[PDB]
């Protein structure tokens, strides 16, 4: 099968600049190279087949280029609506037909460290299990981690996190994450910690409580 | 006008059977090739299966060989998706569609066009099962420097999804409600909080309102401040 490498994996961009995504074949697929554009909760759209034919409707600054095994699409003059997902697709040498990993453009801003805020188990829950909250909000730009301690001990496996899509005003993002022990193992300790890393802080920033504290 | 509707998603045992339809028009459905692409939320596009014009030729994905199906009824322009031993990978939103006609009337060109929005397939044992909501309190070690973070936990139900709205509607601004999370048990869970000013504690009470529409369950949770220490 044919693999599609795109690059970069994501792309940060503000209004009127220029976007550059490549998109690589792991062999030869002459011209048979499709561009998509995808909307979260919308199917992709159409923007540019047989590398750089433009599809009825796409206005002039997206323009597609290259052959073989290198193909670009580049967008000029970046406005809000082209923040989305792109994807290649080859149709040179199928099946089966192949897309690319797709590459993230989303909106740049100055980096924004997250504000960060825990929360116990409530009495309520804990009348069999316990679920302790993390909140990372409105930070920029988006890789963030989370770190979860219980008395010291690094914990593994039994916490999840969800991010927020891009604000449309403020252009951040939020993250929450959650540690879930039973009823048991959280009366067992004491010590309640979650450490982040962000580029916004010069170095982790950990927020705890003590069972019983709040 | 070109129109593609898929339906038959919904939740489906692992091991058991589920025929997707797709529902064409605007275009000459008998005239073209057509395919299925599947996608995992918030995952990459994968190709599934594709069928000529005239039903006479079929291709799938290596992962789907031998377990699904790709068919037509040109008479009644509508594609299928028969998928039989359905595996908790199989999950995904299914589109159906269009490729372009080719130059001879008669192969294959890969040059998919036009996609519906697709259907949900979520392959679980789960029964369905309302939320239970649990508060996300306000306290010292939620609350900096003027902002007071405060939320619900909507935790343990079955299927996706949960709607979550604050204050009947009337809170909007500082909202944040998260990508809900399967766990291991085979029932979500997600977050929604919200950021207000600390001087708001005491003279404005915040609920969640939250709605399982498939349990047909509604849960409005009081969310109050804590002291601490």
């Known amino acids: 099968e044919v693999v599609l490498t795109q690059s970069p994996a994501t792309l940060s961009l503000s209004p009127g600049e220029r976007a550059t995504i490549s998109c690589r074949a792991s062999?030869?697929?002459?011209?048979?190279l499709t561009w998509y554009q995808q909307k979260p909760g919308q199917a992709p759209r159409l923007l540019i087949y047989d590398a750089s034919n433009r599809a009825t409707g796409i206005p002039a600054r997206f323009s597609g280029s290259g052959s073989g095994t290198d193909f670009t699409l580049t967008i000029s003059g970046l406005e809000p609506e082209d923040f989305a997902i792109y994807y290649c697709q080859q149709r040179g040498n199928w099946p089966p037909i192949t897309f690319g990993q797709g590459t993230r453009l989303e909106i740049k801003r100055t980096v924004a460290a997250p504000s960060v805020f825990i929360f116990p188990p409530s009495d309520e829950q804990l009348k069999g299990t316990a679920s302790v909250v993390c909140l990372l909000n409105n930070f920029y730009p988006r890789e963030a981690k989370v770190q979860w301690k219980v008395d010291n001990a690094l914990q593994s496996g039994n916490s999840q996190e969800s991010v927020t899509e891009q604000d449309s005003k403020d252009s951040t993002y939020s993250l929450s994450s959650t540690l879930t022990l039973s009823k048991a193992d959280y009366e067992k300790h004491k010590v309640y910690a979650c450490e982040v890393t962000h580029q916004g802080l010069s170095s982790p920033v950990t927020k705890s409580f003590n069972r019983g504290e709040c | 006008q070109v129109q593609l509707v898929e339906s038959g998603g919904g939740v489906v045992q692992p091991g058991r059977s589920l025929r997707l339809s797709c529902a064409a028009s605007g275009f000459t459905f008998s005239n073209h090739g057509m395919h299925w692409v599947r996608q995992a939320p918030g995952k990459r596009l994968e190709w599934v299966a594709v069928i000529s014009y005239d039903g006479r030729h079929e291709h799938y994905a290596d992962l789907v060989k031998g377990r699904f199906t790709i068919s037509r009824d040109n008479s009644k322009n509508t594609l299928y998706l028969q998928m039989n031993s359905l595996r908790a990978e199989d999950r995904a939103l299914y589109f159906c569609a269009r490729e372009g006609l080719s130059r001879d009337n008669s192969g294959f060109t890969g040059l998919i066009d036009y996609w519906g929005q697709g259907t949900m397939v979520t392959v679980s044992s789960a029964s369905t099962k309302g939320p239970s909501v649990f508060p996300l309190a306000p306290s010292s070690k939620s609350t900096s420097g003027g902002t007071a973070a405060l939320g619900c936990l909507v935790k343990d139900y079955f299927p996706e999804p949960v709607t979550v709205s604050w204050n009947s509607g009337a809170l909007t601004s500082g909202v944040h409600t998260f990508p809900a999370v399967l766990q291991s048990s085979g029932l979500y869970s997600l977050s929604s909080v919200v950021t207000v000013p600390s001087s708001s504690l005491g003279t404005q009470t915040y609920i969640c309102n939250v709605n399982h529409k498939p349990s047909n369950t509604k849960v409005d949770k009081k969310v109050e401040p804590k002291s601490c220490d």
């Open positions: 062999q030869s697929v002459g011209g048979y």
